[PDB]
């Protein structure tokens, strides 16, 4: 592994890792002859501007050029490997091959026609996301009665059996909540379903969170439907503001809405900071909806005790140290194991939760991309806050979190080496 100027040791190792094939015998010579090679290495999207580095004697096919680009990128810039696998499959299978999935999933016709009656609609949902909105939208759009139930008891078992016996003849779209908590009942449902003769309009939605306790034969005979919470600080804040009711945030005093906005921003920034582990947190915790609910109850009761029904209080009147200590030691620092992670949560709360965050000068996230800054909306109402989070920029660098801007890059290169291993 030599030290090529402009190439890292890993890049030279990957050059050796591909250099057993006659397309790139003199790839070191080609790279050292390419003057704009460093500029291309610094490019934001190098896939569309791959320089001519493959050497051959014949006019190569577009698939050959695409795989030459893939070879060179795994040599040099492995971060863009997933996006150029996207355009590589676009090269040899059409650009509209995956254009349905870089697009919100059209569930309606697919579940109405492409799903067998005897194959239940496996309603997979990652924890933290609830997909009952989709089945409610479907039920509203066909305008028929739907029995959405929660399976958590023997009475729930009996009602589920009665509803299944009704729906197997009525042809109904029936959703069964949190079925992953009863693996034995799920096994019973599957082994009955394999012998069932369902209606041509009857399908079962099995809303589950990711657990390895599910029946493998149900996964055999199931129409899997995996969703995710859409990535984005904006998406997390909109989800938080959709879950939080309007009355609770509009209730007096008028700084309660600002405190809830601070809570939503903090929860969104930590939850988005989970997905860039290990640099965000040293391990993946579960900052969930119950954690947000505990935080909301804490701030609600402490602000109620402080204000005692006052329609306005001073920015210095708010128990900032009380909320800081409750967050860091009981709400979100309880699951924190390492003291380094505890200190990190403390520094988040020191920056965010303070009395200095009620003026126009303060910034929610300093040095976004080194030059831009984000400032709080000065409105005092939930409508103004939700308008500010609607009108946020679509771009979201890791400096929004506080991670350096190359956090997305290191996540991409870890995803690329995982792509290599998973396809191996």
UniProtKB/Swiss-Prot annotation:
Residues of the full protein shown: 3921 to 4344 of 4646
Location of N6-acetyllysine modifications: 363
Gene: DYNC1H1
Assembly and interaction partners: Homodimer. The cytoplasmic dynein 1 complex consists of two catalytic heavy chains (HCs) and a number of non-catalytic subunits presented by intermediate chains (ICs), light intermediate chains (LICs) and light chains (LCs); the composition seems to vary in respect to the IC, LIC and LC composition. The heavy chain homodimer serves as a scaffold for the probable homodimeric assembly of the respective non-catalytic subunits. The ICs and LICs bind directly to the HC dimer and dynein LCs assemble on the IC dimer. Interacts with DYNC1LI1; DYNC1LI1 and DYNC1LI2 bind mutually exclusive to DYNC1H1.
Location of region: AAA 6: 85-301
Entry's family note: Belongs to the dynein heavy chain family.
Domain notes per entry: Dynein heavy chains probably consist of an N-terminal stem (which binds cargo and interacts with other dynein components), and the head or motor domain. The motor contains six tandemly-linked AAA domains in the head, which form a ring. A stalk-like structure (formed by two of the coiled coil domains) protrudes between AAA 4 and AAA 5 and terminates in a microtubule-binding site. A seventh domain may also contribute to this ring; it is not clear whether the N-terminus or the C-terminus forms this extra domain.
Noted disease: Charcot-Marie-Tooth disease, axonal, type 2O: An axonal form of Charcot-Marie-Tooth disease, a disorder of the peripheral nervous system, characterized by progressive weakness and atrophy, initially of the peroneal muscles and later of the distal muscles of the arms. Charcot-Marie-Tooth disease is classified in two main groups on the basis of electrophysiologic properties and histopathology: primary peripheral demyelinating neuropathies (designated CMT1 when they are dominantly inherited) and primary peripheral axonal neuropathies (CMT2).
Protein name, per record: Cytoplasmic dynein 1 heavy chain 1
Species per Swiss-Prot/TrEMBL record: Homo sapiens (Human)
In-chain residues carrying the UniProt-annotated modification Phosphoserine: 242
Cellular location(s): Cytoplasm, Cytoskeleton
Protein task: Cytoplasmic dynein 1 acts as a motor for the intracellular retrograde motility of vesicles and organelles along microtubules. Dynein has ATPase activity; the force-producing power stroke is thought to occur on release of ADP. Plays a role in mitotic spindle assembly and metaphase plate congression.
């Amino acid at each position: 592994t030599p030290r090529i100027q402009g190439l890292t040791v890993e890049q030279a190792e990957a050059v050796v890792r591909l250099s057993c094939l006659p397309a790139f015998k003199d790839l070191i010579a080609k790279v050292q002859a390419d003057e704009q090679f460093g500029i291309w290495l610094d490019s934001s999207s190098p896939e569309q501007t791959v320089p001519y580095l493959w050497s051959e004697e014949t006019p190569a096919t577009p698939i050959g050029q695409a795989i030459h680009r893939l070879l060179l990128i795994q040599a040099f810039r492995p971060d863009r490997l997933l996006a150029m696998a996207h355009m590589f499959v676009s090269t040899n299978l059409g650009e509209s091959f995956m254009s349905i999935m870089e697009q919100p999933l059209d569930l309606t016709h697919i579940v109405g026609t492409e799903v067998k009656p005897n194959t239940p609609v496996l309603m997979c949902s990652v924890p933290g996301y609830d997909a009952s909105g989709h089945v409610e939208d479907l039920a509203a759009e066909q305008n028929t009665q739907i029995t959405s139930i929660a399976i958590g008891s023997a009475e729930g078992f009996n009602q589920a059996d009665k509803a299944i016996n009704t729906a197997v003849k009525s042809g109904r779209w029936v959703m069964l909540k949190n079925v992953h908590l009863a693996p034995g009942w799920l096994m019973q449902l599957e082994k009955k379903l394999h012998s069932l003769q369902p209606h041509a309009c009857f399908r079962l939605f099995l809303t589950m969170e990711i657990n390895p306790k599910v029946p493998v034969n149900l996964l055999r005979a199931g129409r899997i439907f995996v969703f995710e919470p859409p990535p984005g600080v904006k998406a997390n804040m909109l989800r938080t503001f959709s879950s939080i009711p309007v009355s609770r945030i509009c209730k007096s005093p008028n700084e309660r809405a600002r405190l809830y906005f601070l809570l939503a921003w903090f929860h969104a920034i930590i939850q988005e900071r989970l997905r860039y582990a290990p640099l965000g947190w040293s391990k993946k915790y579960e900052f969930g909806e119950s954690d947000l609910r505990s935080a909301c109850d804490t701030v609600d009761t402490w602000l109620d005790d402080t204000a005692k029904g006052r329609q306005n209080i001073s920015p210095d009147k708010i128990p900032w140290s009380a909320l800081k200590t409750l967050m860091a030691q009981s709400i979100y620092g309880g699951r924190v194991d390492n003291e380094f992670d505890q200190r990190l949560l403390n520094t988040f709360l020191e920056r965010l939760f303070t009395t200095r965050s009620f003026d126009s000068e303060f910034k929610l996230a300093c040095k976004v991309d080194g030059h831009k800054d984000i400032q709080m909306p000065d409105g005092i109402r939930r409508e103004e806050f939700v308008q500010w989070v609607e009108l946020l920029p679509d771009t979201q660098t890791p400096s929004w979190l506080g991670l350096p801007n190359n956090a997305e890059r290191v996540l991409l290169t870890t995803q690329g080496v995982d792509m290599i291993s998973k396809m191996l």
